[PDB]
Amino acid sequence: AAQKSFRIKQKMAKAKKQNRPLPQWIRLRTNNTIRYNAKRRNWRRTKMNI
Amino acid sequence: GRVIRNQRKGAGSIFTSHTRLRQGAAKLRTLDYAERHGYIRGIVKQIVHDSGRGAPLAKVVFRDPYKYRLREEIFIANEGVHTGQFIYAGKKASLNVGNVLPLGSVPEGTIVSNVEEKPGDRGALARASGNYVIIIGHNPDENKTRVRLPSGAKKVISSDARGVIGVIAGGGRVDKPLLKAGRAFHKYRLKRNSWPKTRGVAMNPVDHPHGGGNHQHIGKASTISRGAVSGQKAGLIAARRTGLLRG
Amino acid sequence: AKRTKKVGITGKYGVRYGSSLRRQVKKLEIQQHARYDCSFCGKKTVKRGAAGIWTCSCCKKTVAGGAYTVSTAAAATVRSTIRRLREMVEA
Amino acid sequence: AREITDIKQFLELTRRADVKTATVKINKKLNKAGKPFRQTKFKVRGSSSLYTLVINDAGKAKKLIQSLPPTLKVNRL
Amino acid sequence: AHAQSKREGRHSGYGKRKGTREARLPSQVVWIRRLRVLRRLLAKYRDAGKIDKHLYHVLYKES
Amino acid sequence: AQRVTFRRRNPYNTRSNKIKVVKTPGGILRAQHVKKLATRPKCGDCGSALQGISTLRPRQYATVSKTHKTVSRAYGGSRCANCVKERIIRAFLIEEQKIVKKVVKEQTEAAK
RNA sequence: UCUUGGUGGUAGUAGCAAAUAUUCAAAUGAGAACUUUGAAGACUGAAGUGGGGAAAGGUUCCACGUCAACAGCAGUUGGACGUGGGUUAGUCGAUCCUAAGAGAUGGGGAAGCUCCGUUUCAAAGGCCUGAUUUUAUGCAGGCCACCAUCGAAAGGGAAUCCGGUUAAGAUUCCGGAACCUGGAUAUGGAUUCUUCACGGUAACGUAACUGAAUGUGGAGACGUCGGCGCGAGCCCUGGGAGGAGUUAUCUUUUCUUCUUAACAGCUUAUCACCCCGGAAUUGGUUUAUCCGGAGAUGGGGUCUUAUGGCUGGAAGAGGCCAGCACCUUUGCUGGCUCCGGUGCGCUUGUGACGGCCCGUGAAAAUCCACAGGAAGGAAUAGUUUUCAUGCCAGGUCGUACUGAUAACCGCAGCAGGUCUCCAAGGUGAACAGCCUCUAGUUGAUAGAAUAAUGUAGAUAAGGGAAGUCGGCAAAAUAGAUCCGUAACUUCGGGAUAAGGAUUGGCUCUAAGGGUCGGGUACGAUCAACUUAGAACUGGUACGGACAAGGGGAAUCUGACUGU
RNA sequence: CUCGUAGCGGUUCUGACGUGCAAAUCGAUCGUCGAAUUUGGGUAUAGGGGCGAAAGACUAAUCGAACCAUCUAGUAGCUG
Ligand SMILES: [Mg+2]
Ligand SMILES: [Mg+2]
Ligand SMILES: [Mg+2]
Ligand SMILES: [Mg+2]
Ligand SMILES: [Mg+2]
Ligand SMILES: [Mg+2]
Ligand SMILES: [Mg+2]
Ligand SMILES: [Mg+2]
Ligand SMILES: [Mg+2]
Ligand SMILES: [Mg+2]
Ligand SMILES: [Mg+2]
Ligand SMILES: [Mg+2]
Ligand SMILES: [Mg+2]
Ligand SMILES: [Mg+2]
Ligand SMILES: [Mg+2]
Ligand SMILES: [Mg+2]
Ligand SMILES: [Mg+2]
Ligand SMILES: [Mg+2]
Ligand SMILES: [Mg+2]
Ligand SMILES: [Mg+2]
Ligand SMILES: [Mg+2]
Ligand SMILES: [Mg+2]
Ligand SMILES: [Mg+2]
Ligand SMILES: [Mg+2]
Ligand SMILES: [Mg+2]
Ligand SMILES: [Mg+2]
Ligand SMILES: [Mg+2]
Ligand SMILES: [Mg+2]
Ligand SMILES: [Mg+2]
Ligand SMILES: [Mg+2]
Ligand SMILES: [Mg+2]
Ligand SMILES: [Mg+2]
Ligand SMILES: [Mg+2]
Ligand SMILES: [Mg+2]
Ligand SMILES: [Mg+2]
Ligand SMILES: [Mg+2]
Ligand SMILES: [Mg+2]
Ligand SMILES: [Mg+2]
Ligand SMILES: [Mg+2]
Ligand SMILES: [Mg+2]
Ligand SMILES: [Mg+2]
Ligand SMILES: [Mg+2]
Ligand SMILES: [Mg+2]
Ligand SMILES: [Mg+2]
Ligand SMILES: [Mg+2]
Ligand SMILES: [Mg+2]
Ligand SMILES: [Mg+2]
Ligand SMILES: [Mg+2]
Ligand SMILES: [Mg+2]
Ligand SMILES: [Mg+2]
Ligand SMILES: [Mg+2]
Ligand SMILES: [Mg+2]
Ligand SMILES: [Mg+2]
Ligand SMILES: [Mg+2]
Ligand SMILES: [Mg+2]
Ligand SMILES: [Mg+2]
Ligand SMILES: [Mg+2]
Ligand SMILES: [Mg+2]
Ligand SMILES: [Mg+2]
Ligand SMILES: [Mg+2]
Ligand SMILES: [Mg+2]
Ligand SMILES: [Mg+2]
Ligand SMILES: [Mg+2]
C-alpha cells in the first residue's frame, strides 16, 4: 500500500525469499521423492491474504 | 414477531443525543455559603446559541470565593439579559430580571425560571424557550411554596429552592411554521434520531401491532392500558378521553 | 417598482407550502429580518443573531430576546410585573 | 543568504573564525544607456549564512580583493 | 484572422449567438462598468472643483 | 499548459494540502505546498485584531523576539489600547465612587 | 437424476463480431498480421487512453537470459519462466493530539465465561527548591484537587528548496542554499552609580530592554452561497535576440527558446486605530445603503504583511544556439537568455462585505502574551539578555511499481465496480458535442467473399395511426433575437403556454471607456467586445456539422422537493 | 425554483445479450442535479437480533429470519 507496517513488509519479505523453484541438487539426493516446489506462489495466481 | 422502533430506542445506539456542538450543561451555580446567606455578583460575557436548544445560553462569570480564580457558569439566558450585565445570585439579592433568588425570598406572583425542584439540583423547571413559573402561594412554617408549572400543574417546592427572574428567552419559536421537511431535518439533526416517523398502520404485522391487512386500519382499540408492556404500548397509552375536546 | 402585490419576502417559496402558511411565515420573517432600535446606543442597529440573540452592530452589545422579535409581549408583562413587585417589596 | 551593504562589517565578518572560504563573481551587466558596467560580487561562506557584498563600481572591486586576509580561500568565478 | 474579423464586426449576427444576451455579456457587468464611470466622473468634478459638494450628492444618488 | 502534481502522498484537497503553482529556475511549473495562513491575535476584551503584534502560526511565536509579541503599554499583547484606556477610566471612577459611597453610608448611619 | 475417477457423440461444431485502423520497408529470427526501428495513417482530445496518488496488491518495478506451459490466433514479445539488481529523510508521512467512540483501574453484579462503569461512594500525586559544599541536590520548605490508555498515513500538527544524477531511488542520493527542535556555551552588542532601556501627544516604534507561584487572555479554531476587489499560475498578444517550417505565388510569415525555488533583508494593505478639527444647505460612500456629536467629511499619522516590487539565493544553474574537435579522457570554446501590453477570460488563493437558518456550522495536544511582583542583581560594564554570531545532535518504521478495457475486487489478462489532485487552442453560454497541440496509445485472432435471417444505422412515392391492448418504436420540435401569449390561480405562477417572424458572408455606420490640466473660448495617448442600424451579395442559403422543448383540451390520483 | 453537464439514480424500448463481456451488463431513451444532495475514511448498532422516509426491504451473490460448527447418521405411514 506504499505506506506499510513493518509487520506487513516483514511477511512480504519472507514471501519473496520463498518465491523460488526447487534447488536442482535436492532432486538428486538418495531416496528423494520431491519433484517440485508444491508451495509456489504467484502474485497473479493466489493472493496471500496479508 | 420483531422488536418495534419504540422498543429499540432504549438500547441507545443510533438514538442518542447529537451532543458535539452543545455548549455544556445549562445549570445553576452550585449552592454554597455565598448563595445561602448573602449574594454573589456575576457578569454576563456572552449570550451564545446552544445547538439543539431553542433558547440562548448566557455565560455568566463569577469569582471563586475560596481560591483566586474565575468560575464560568453557564445559564439559560432570560429575555432581557444582556452582555455586560451584572447578575446577582444569592438570598439577599435584588429582584431584577436574571437575578437568582430562592423562591421563599421572592413575593407572590413573581415570574421565575430555571427553578430547582429540590434545593441545589441546579435548575429543573421552566427551561424551554418562553416558559416561566408563577409563585402562587406560601407556607412559611415548614417552608414550602406553591407554583404553577408550564403545563399548568401545581407543584409544592422547598422555599430554599432557587429560580432566575424572568422568562426563558427565545419565546415564540414554535409559532413559526417549518414549511418543509428540510427545516425539520436540521432541527432534528442536532437533537437526536427521532425523525422521520413511519406510521405503524403503514407496516407489516411483524413490525407493528397496527400494520397489515388489505386496508390500512388499526384493527384493535388504539387505547392501551398502563398495565401493558413493551410491544403492546403502540398507540394511545393510558388515555382518559380520546378525540377532540368538545363537551 | 413594486414587484409583488402581497407575497413580499415569501416570494422565495414560489407557489409551494400553502398560502396560509406563507402568510404565517411572512409576518415572522419580516419581524426577524428587521433592524431594531438599540436601547443602549440609540442607533437602529440590532439584528437577529440565531434566535433569541440580538446583537447591535455598533456598541457590540447582545441582548437576549424573543425568537423573532426583540421583546415578546409576554416578557413585556414580566418587566412590568417584576418592577411592580420590586417596589412593593422595598416600599 | 544575507546581503551585506557595507564595507566595515564585511571586513569584520571576514575574520570571524567560522568563515574559511569565499567566492568572487564577475558579472557583465551591459544595459543600453544607463550603466553597462562590470559587476563584482563578494560572497562570504559563514557557518549559517552566505554573505554577498555587491560592488558595481569597478574601482573598489580592485581595492577589496587586495585587502582580503590570506587565511581565507578565494574562488574566482 | 477570425479574431481580426470579430474586431472589425463580423460573425456577430443573430445566426452566430448561441447564448442569451446575459450569458454573452451579463447585464450586471454592464451596470458595474457604467456606474463606476459616473462615480469616477463625479469624484473628478468635485475634487477638481467644477461641482460643489452639494450638487455632487444629488448626482451621486441619481447615478 | 504544463500540469502539476501533489508533492506529498495526500491526494485530497484538504485544508492542510493546499498548493500554489510556481515556476522553477529549471523553467518548469511545479506545485508548492502552502502553509496555513496565520490569524491575528484578537483582543482579550473586545475580540478585535490588536496591532503591532506579528501574525504567525502559534508555534512560530517562540522563535521571534519579544518586540514582535508585545506593545510597550500595560496589557500590551493582551488588550487593544481602547479597552485598556476604558479599563483605566473604569478602575479610577469606582474607588472615587467607593470612597464617596463609604462617606455617604458612614454619615447616614452616624445620624440615626 | 447413487459416489469417485476416467471417457465419448454432439464437433473441428457453436463460436473467438463493443471500445473508428491499420499500412509499407528494414532489422532480429528456424519461424513475423502481431517483436524492434523508421515512415505513414489515425485516435484518446486536458471531467484524457495524459502526469500523480488513497485503499488494495506485493516485487508485478528494472536488467540479462528464455519460450515447455500461460497471453481463448500467433509470439523472436510479455505483468509469463529462470537468474539477479533495486526502495537512502532532523524537514514527506507514521510516531504525538483529541473526535465520534473504545477501554483498564477502584468498586458493584454474575455459578461462571465475564458484565457494568470511565470518574465514579478510592488513603488514586508529581512539580519546581530561591539556587550548588553536612547534598547520591533534600533529611525542608513551597506549589498544584485533576485521575489510565487506545482512537485520523484526508482533521490539529516544529522545520527543505532548486539543479543534477539511476537500468530501476529521490522534497530521501550528490552539489549548492536554508530552516526547526533539543542541548551546551563563548564573544560582541544592549541595559546598569536613577540597579531591571529609551522615543512618540497618541495609535505605537526599536536589535536587546530580569520576572517565580498564581491567574487571565490569545492563537490551534472552523458553515454554506452570492457578487466585488486583489494576487499567483495559465491563456491571448507587441518589440527584439536565436533555431526550425513553407516558399510556383503570397506571407516584416507559421511553430518554437527567452526561466528564477525554499530562505533572508528593505519596502508594500483593504480593514482597523490615533491626533487636529467640529459637521444641515447633511456629508462620505459600496456592484450591492451603510456610516457620522458615542465625532462624519477633510488634513496628518500608526499597525497587520495576505500579497506584490527590489536585492541576496543566482546565473555560476536551467534553456536556445553557434563554432571547432570528430575510437577526440570525451567534450572544448563562444554568444544570447531582453523589454512590454491586455482582460466580464480559465483555474486557484485571499480580503472586505452581503444573504441564509426552530441548522449559527469539532476537540485536544501545543505555542505565545499579559496581570502579578517571588527572588536576585549595579563597575566602569555587576547582573540579565526572547539581540547578533559561534558549537553539537536529530533515533525507529515506510518509501520500488500499478492504481486499473492486464498489476485492486468480481473463479480470469471479465465492456462491471472502486476515493482524489493538475487541466492547452478553436467553435460555443458552456468542464456540452466536434476538431487540434503536449503527453499517450494504435491494444481487442486474422484473411477472403458480400447469400438468407439477424444486430446497429439510414431513406422512402401517395396516404398519415386505417397499425396496435395501447402512437410501442420512430418522426416531428429544438439555439438565440424580436413580437405575441389564454383558461385557471394559493396572485408567487401557469409561461419557453399557445403561436409568428429573423438568422450567412462582406463593406460600412453609430453609441458605450481609461489615463493625461488649468487663470495670486482643449485635444494628444491607449484599449475592449457588446449592442443597434445600413447597404451590397448568393441556385432564398444561413442555430448550414454539432448541439437542441413537440404542443394543446380534459379526467383520475398523490399537494409539492424527497424515499 | 427551474433548463442542463459532471455526478447520483434507474422510466421505457417489455432494444441488444440471455451456455453473456457481465450470477444484473451494454445501448438508446430517461429522473434528478446546491441539497431531506453525492461520497471516502473512522465509529456505533448483531440474528428471533439489528436496521428500516416501511418494500418483509437490507444485514458479505444468503433473508417471511444471516453464516459457521455441533447435537445429527435428527424423524419420514413418502419416492428411488
Ligand atoms: Mg510492526
Ligand atoms: Mg408518518
Ligand atoms: Mg406494506
Ligand atoms: Mg457568460
Ligand atoms: Mg440584475
Ligand atoms: Mg494530516
Ligand atoms: Mg461422474
Ligand atoms: Mg465432451
Ligand atoms: Mg466456425
Ligand atoms: Mg468472420
Ligand atoms: Mg470521438
Ligand atoms: Mg480526435
Ligand atoms: Mg526482456
Ligand atoms: Mg495462444
Ligand atoms: Mg504457441
Ligand atoms: Mg516490465
Ligand atoms: Mg522474475
Ligand atoms: Mg512534518
Ligand atoms: Mg495520550
Ligand atoms: Mg494516540
Ligand atoms: Mg478541523
Ligand atoms: Mg530536486
Ligand atoms: Mg519513479
Ligand atoms: Mg542535499
Ligand atoms: Mg560588552
Ligand atoms: Mg537601547
Ligand atoms: Mg497570541
Ligand atoms: Mg529551503
Ligand atoms: Mg476619516
Ligand atoms: Mg476546485
Ligand atoms: Mg538569540
Ligand atoms: Mg521514494
Ligand atoms: Mg515513488
Ligand atoms: Mg507511481
Ligand atoms: Mg474473493
Ligand atoms: Mg487474454
Ligand atoms: Mg477551449
Ligand atoms: Mg468566444
Ligand atoms: Mg473493434
Ligand atoms: Mg412515406
Ligand atoms: Mg411525402
Ligand atoms: Mg385503431
Ligand atoms: Mg385492426
Ligand atoms: Mg415514444
Ligand atoms: Mg429571446
Ligand atoms: Mg413559443
Ligand atoms: Mg398549459
Ligand atoms: Mg408524490
Ligand atoms: Mg397516500
Ligand atoms: Mg389534501
Ligand atoms: Mg418526486
Ligand atoms: Mg429542483
Ligand atoms: Mg428539474
Ligand atoms: Mg446527469
Ligand atoms: Mg425497474
Ligand atoms: Mg430486454
Ligand atoms: Mg466466455
Ligand atoms: Mg436544476
Ligand atoms: Mg465518484
Ligand atoms: Mg426478536
Ligand atoms: Mg406484503
Ligand atoms: Mg445458514
Ligand atoms: Mg439426514
Dist. CA B6–CA B203, nearest whole Å: 14
Yes or no, beta carbons of B107 and C16 under 8 Å apart: no
Q: What are phi and psi of B71, to 5 degrees?
A: -110, 120
Which sign, positive or negative, has the C-alpha torsion B47, B51, B54, B60? Answer: negative
Dist. CA B32–CA C5, nearest whole Å: 61
Length of chain A: 50
Alpha carbon separation from B75 to B40, B134, E17, F105 (Å, rounded): 15, 20, 64, 34
Length of chain D: 77
Yes or no, beta carbons of C66 and B172 under 8 Å apart: yes
Q: Are B113 and B124 contacting, i.e. CB atoms less than 8 angstroms apart? A: no
Using a CB-CB distance cutoff of 8 angstroms, which residues of chain C are in contact with residue B169? Answer: 52, 64-66, 75
Query: Solved by what technique?
Result: cryo-EM
Dist. CA B79–CA B164, nearest whole Å: 11
Instruction: Please tell me the distance between residue B133's alpha carbon and the centre of ligand 21 in angstroms.
Output: 42
The C-alpha cell that represents C81 in the structure block: 410585573
Whether any strand H atom is under 7 angstroms from the Cβ of B156: the reply reads no
What letter would DSSP give residue C6? Answer: S
Count Cα atoms within 13 angstroms, Cβ side, for B149. Answer: 10
- The three-class DSSP label of residue E61 is helix
Strand B133-139, strand B144-148: pairing: antiparallel
Q: Which residues contact D19 (CB under 8 A, 6 or more apart)?
A: D13, D44, D45, D46, D47, D72
Q: What are phi and psi of B5, to 5 degrees?
A: -60, -35
Alpha carbon separation from B231 to B47, B202, B208, C31 (Å, rounded): 44, 17, 8, 46
Nearest alpha-carbon partner for B45 in B10, B86, B89: B86
Dist. CA B214–CA B198, nearest whole Å: 18
Name the residue in chain B with its Cα closest to that of C30: B176
Dist. CA B130–CA C67, nearest whole Å: 9
Distance in Å from G364's C1' to A33's CA comes to 65
Which of B50-64 are b and which e, b meaning 16 or more Cβ less than 10 Å from the residue's Cβ? beebbbbbbbbebee
Name residue F84's beta-bridge partners: none
Alpha carbon separation from D4 to D53, D55, D70, F97 (Å, rounded): 5, 10, 21, 61
Dist. CA F98–CA F16, nearest whole Å: 54
Neighbours of ion ligand 2 (CB under 5 A): B 197, 199
Neighbour subunits, B (≥3 Cβ pairs < 8 A): C
- Resolution of this model in Å is 3.0
Alpha helices, H only, B20-169: 34-37
Alpha helices, H only, A1-50: 6-17
Dist. CA B36–CA B81, nearest whole Å: 23
The C-alpha cell that represents B16 in the structure block: 442518542
Name which of B54, B95, B169 is nearest C64 (Cβ-Cβ): B169
Distance in Å from G393's C1' to F53's CA comes to 34
CA geometry: angle C46, C51, C54, nearest 5 deg: 20
Cβ–Cβ contact C53 with B under 8 A = yes
Dist. CA B45–CA F46, nearest whole Å: 11
Cβ–Cβ contact C85 with B under 8 A = yes
Which ligand gives the minimal distance to the CA of F13? 30
Q: In angstroms, what separates the C-alpha of B221 from chain C's closest C-alpha?
A: 34
Dist. CA D39–CA D53, nearest whole Å: 11
Whether any strand H atom is under 7 angstroms from the Cβ of B205: the reply reads yes
Contacts within 8 Å (CB) and 24+ apart, F9-16: F9/A2, F9/A3
Name the residue in chain B with its Cα closest to that of C86: B95
Which of B167-206 are b and which e, b meaning 16 or more Cβ less than 10 Å from the residue's Cβ? bbbbbbbeebbebeeeeeeeeeebeeeeeeeeebbebeee
Interface test with B, best of C21, C53, C55 (most B CBs within 10 A): C53
Distance in Å from G155's C1' to F49's CA comes to 26
Q: In angstroms, what separates the C-alpha of B99 from chain C's closest C-alpha?
A: 11
Q: Are C10 and C25 contacting, i.e. CB atoms less than 8 angstroms apart? A: yes
Which ligand gives the minimal distance to the CA of F26? 22
Yes or no, beta carbons of C52 and B83 under 8 Å apart: no
Name residue B78's beta-bridge partners: B168
